[PDB]
Amino acid sequence: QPGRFGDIQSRTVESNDLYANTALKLARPSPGMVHVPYTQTPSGFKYWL
Amino acid sequence: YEHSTVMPNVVGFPYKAHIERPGYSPLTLQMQVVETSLEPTLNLEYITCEYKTVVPSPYVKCCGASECSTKEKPDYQCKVYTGVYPFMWGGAYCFCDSENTQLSEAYVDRSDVCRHDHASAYKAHTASLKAKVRVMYGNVNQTVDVYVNGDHAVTIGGTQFIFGPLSSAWTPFDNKIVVYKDEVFNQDFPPYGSGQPGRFGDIQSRTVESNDLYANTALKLARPSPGMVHVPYTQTPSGFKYWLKEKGTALNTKAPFGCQIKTNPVRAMNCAVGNIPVSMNLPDSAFTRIVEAPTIIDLTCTVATCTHSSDFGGVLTLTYKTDKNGDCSVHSHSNVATLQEATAKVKTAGKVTLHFSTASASPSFVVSLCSARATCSASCEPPKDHIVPYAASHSNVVFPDMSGTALSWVQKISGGLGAFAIGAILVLVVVTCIGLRR
Amino acid sequence: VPMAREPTVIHGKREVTLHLHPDHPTLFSYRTLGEDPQYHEEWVTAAVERTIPVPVDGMEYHWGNNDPVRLWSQLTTEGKPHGWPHQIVQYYYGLYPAATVSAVVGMSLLALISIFASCYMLVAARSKCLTPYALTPGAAVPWTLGILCCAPRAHA
Ligand SMILES: *[C@@H]1O[C@H](CO)[C@@H](O[C@@H]2O[C@H](CO)[C@@H](O[C@@H]3O[C@H](CO)[C@@H](O)[C@H](O)[C@@H]3O)[C@H](O)[C@H]2NC(C)=O)[C@H](O)[C@H]1NC(C)=O
DSSP: OTTSTTSEEOSSTTOSOOEEOOOOEEOOOOTTOOOOOEEOOOOHHHHHO | OEEEEEEEOOTTOOEEEEEOOTTBOOEEEEEEEEEEEEEEEEEEEEEEOOEEEEOOOOEEESSSOOOOOOOOOTTOEEEEEESOOOOOSSOOOSSSSSOOEEEEEEEEEEOTTTTTSOEEEEEEEEEEEEEEEEEEBTTBOOEEEEESSSSOEEEETTEEEEEOOOSOOOOSOOSEEEEETTEEEOOOOOOTTOOOTTSTTSEEBSSTTOSOOEEOOOOEEOOOOTTOOOOOEEOOOOHHHHHHHTOOOOSTTTOGGGOEEETTTTEEESOOOSEEEEEEEOOTTSSOBTTTSOOEEEEEEEEEEEBOOSSOOEEEEEEEEESSOOOEEEEESSTTEEESOSEEOOOTTOEEEEEEEEOSSSOEEEEEETTOOEEEEOOOBOOSOOEESSOOOSOOOOOOOTTSHHHHHHHHHHHHHHHHHHHHHHHHHHHHHHHHHO | OOOOOOOEEEEOSSEEEEEEOOSSOEEEEEEOOSSSOOOEEEEEOSOEEEEEEOOTTOEEEEETTSOOEEEEEOOOOSSOSSSOHHHHHHHHHHSSTTHHHHHHHHHHHHHHHHHHHHHHHHHHHHHHHHTTGGGTTOOOOHHHHHHSOOSOSSOO
């Protein structure tokens, strides 16, 4: 779940697959700019720490 | 043709009114409140802002004495001090060592930007609400802006509407109001001319561009320390700033019934309470003659599914027979269930399906399309979901039907007990009358 | 000015739990939009978790510089209607859990009073009809003795 321990999970360190659930959502850019807005729940590993 | 109804004061509710003239086919009007606006009447009491202390440069009289002169200034202070021996960068002036005198003077004023940043103290009374209502029927849409008191008439498609006075006389504002920028506070401010230092209204001005000013800020002066020129004084800090830091809550964040407080002009938007009586007067072109309308007979209704959720969670199938294809005006004759549509296309096939919204375990309501009638009864289940992002689309009527499962169980048990009691009383009376007959 | 992040919303029974993650001190307030509201304001500085009530009237919360968000509860419960009498009471206790118990107690008490009065009336009638024949050594009238269960089953 986003924002808590295990929002991203990997089977091993070198595993090529990854599960991520971080509530990443795009937004409409403001007039006259080139910037790609987005919003995303902060990392759950840092919160657990 | 005169008609009158009563419709709720809630924004977005689909109200449908059935007008049933004896010689014509019934029609259904759809009325919706797009928004309301409840605005009070205000009498400005005064204006408050931060003050500014004016301290003129002192007058030191070398080898002499000076005398204080009174002036008519707000919270004015003046004193004289004897024995001063001031200094400058280059040397000590006032060559007389001890025969000198300083005149200290100070007063207070309205700040430089009081016309941009100030608070207004009002008395509020006699609220009057406007509204904006969307009316549709036949083939007219179209939204009008009205005064909700029985003294304004609007014409939509030749029909004359008057939206009568609100059921309640409830207003969120108290008698006394403080407005700052975009914020309204139910405050009990001091009257004019009796403010106190350090709190709201230490300086009071009657109007933004007035010339008078009442100030009460506890200004005092003190002797200058020997050998220097500074005019020392002490004063209580501004009451406007200490109000800003500690005014406490607001009305924007606290008002009941979920109504949005705005300012300029002060008003409370979409503040769902009461009922609105409506009086309408229709032309003859609104109705349709009974000859060109379809004729329908043998009407029965059955419910397919029911679940008393906030949305339109009930589905109803309705069968009839008709001579010719057409269009009818449906209506639900109880507020226990709210239909979704106002007209239905009737065809030779003999089926129409309608969606309704309810909030009771077992509703029982009578539904009519065109001229026919039928009674619909249902057995409804709770929803599984807990929380929704939209308001209820029903009238929030919860008492079940008398023929529902629960209250029919109540009848069965009560009837059994009543029969037992009646048998007991009959046995007793028979025994007593047998004893008497002998 | 910036826009605060959308909190994580978890739906409960007449409740909402919001997970709040700020970058900098941001103000969070809410109110219940019924007749008597439940006010609250706070300056959230760390990552926290709040539980706020959502009655059938509704609620709204204002988080940061975002627009306020309104949420409405729904008439959901745990009993099963249209079933046995002991499940209808559960259903009507799940929603409105204050008048259901009062109504059930009133109905049960009334039924008990009625049944006790009926049984009392039968007892009084039987005593009245048996006390005259019980002052003389008389026959029980086997037609009467069989129909009415008196004290002597077969003795006289
Ligand atoms: C009576 O008039 C009102 C306003 O003219 C009608 O409401 C309007 O209905 C149209 C069609 O659904 C809406 O257009 C659509 O809106 C959605 C909203 O996201 C948009 O995504 C679509 O691209 C499209 O623009 C329109 O917004 C809506 N206007 C309002 C103010 O609600 C209404 O349907 C009419 N009633 C009848 C019975 O004709």
